[PDB]
Amino acid sequence: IVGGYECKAYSQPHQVSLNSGYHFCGGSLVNENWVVSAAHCYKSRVEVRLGEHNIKVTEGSEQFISSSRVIRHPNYSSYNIDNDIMLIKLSKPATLNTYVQPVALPSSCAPAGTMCTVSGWGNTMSSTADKNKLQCLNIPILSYSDCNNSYPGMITNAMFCAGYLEGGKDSCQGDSGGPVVCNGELQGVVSWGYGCAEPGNPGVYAKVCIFNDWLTSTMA
Template sequence: MCSFSSTLFLLEESNLAIISMKFAWSVAISGVASVNALRKLSSFIVGGDEVAPNSEPYVISLQRSGAHFCGASLAGYLNKAITAGHCHNSYGVTAVAGAHRIELYESRSQSRSVTQFIVHPSYNSYLLENDIAIIKLSSPFVENEYVKPLFLPRQEFQDWLPHNSPVRVCGWGNTVPGDVPSQMAKELHCIDINVIAYSICNDRQHYNGELSPGMMCAGVDGLGGKDACGGDSGGPVKYSDMVVGITSWSYGHPHQGQGAYYPGVYTDVAWYRNWIDLQ
């Protein structure tokens, strides 16, 4: 199972209480544990590799008191970014773009204070539905070779990306099971995986109807071993030159064999495109 990310204490206490209660119990339905009761916020890049510095210039580190706790991405705008709703934190958050080795000062990076965290009005912290938020920045980032937004997809609905489309997921989360601080990635890591069609991911062999509209799946179906399993929460899923997803949650851990049938679940950005533009 994915363990709790060590960053969860940064969530609002009310949300944390709800999430903690949810993960503390499981419900048997026809002899199978309910996925809802076992959802875990995503915090690991598993099976990926360190990438070349600043090769993914749209990726943002959200930090508090200098410590990374969630990812985010620049897409379509320089004065705001997109992240997961469960990354919401009201005070003292800094967005850092152009970073690679985040525990060091890097002259190529840019920091901006987060002035507003706009969580989707229908966000459900129990089911992690509508798990998307917009962060407003104190001033726009300056675009250069180290900081560059990707495009946003147009408004689309379920399964708009073909099954097996190649996507890239990036983050600074843990690279092994557990919350061992020394195993948190110091450099940006990414994995290359594939979109798994909603109809497949939600079938009886996978999530068995537990997915909700606005979610998408990606992984290596039938094999596992690669996944964003939380620190990675809120980070981007890239397809071509677009940010198409947000790291949200998973069930099980790919190193324990469950990733073959329970791939990572991400927020489908295209589903929320019109809402993003209005914020």
């Protein structure tokens, strides 16, 4: 997260870290057994780390649970990062407490201009911002035209841009798979972008509101 601030510890209880030796992606807990992430973060097996704030220091609030299933959306297209959503089933259920809680799925698609929150342990591109401590950033959903203007012909129905065209505030690699929460619902998943926080290149996110049927049926 570039241009954001350190989240208040455990203020994003649904946020998880995907780890197979080191942190490589984020994810969002949606119930005691499942995590929603980005399909480009796919790995056959991964350890999901919940209840984290500082991913380098053991705090006593964490739960490390290995995945039992990692399911990418069947229509995921890697060359254009389309339908970049994935479900991770925990081998054992997570204990819901003050540090670990699920985030609700969207009841509808949020309109452009809706202010949301994106978080993660990705690069901050700052000498004073510690990416090891969960970072938070408020970003507005951008219009389809601003999105397509930024990435001509590359925006699909499963995508939406959010952030600032002027640059300075955006998600980055490391945040991939992470949550974009708007009004208490998971509207997006950190997906892609050119560079990080670069003017004219806002973040692109997987639009969760169009995958409700696949998500619920898969977890059913």
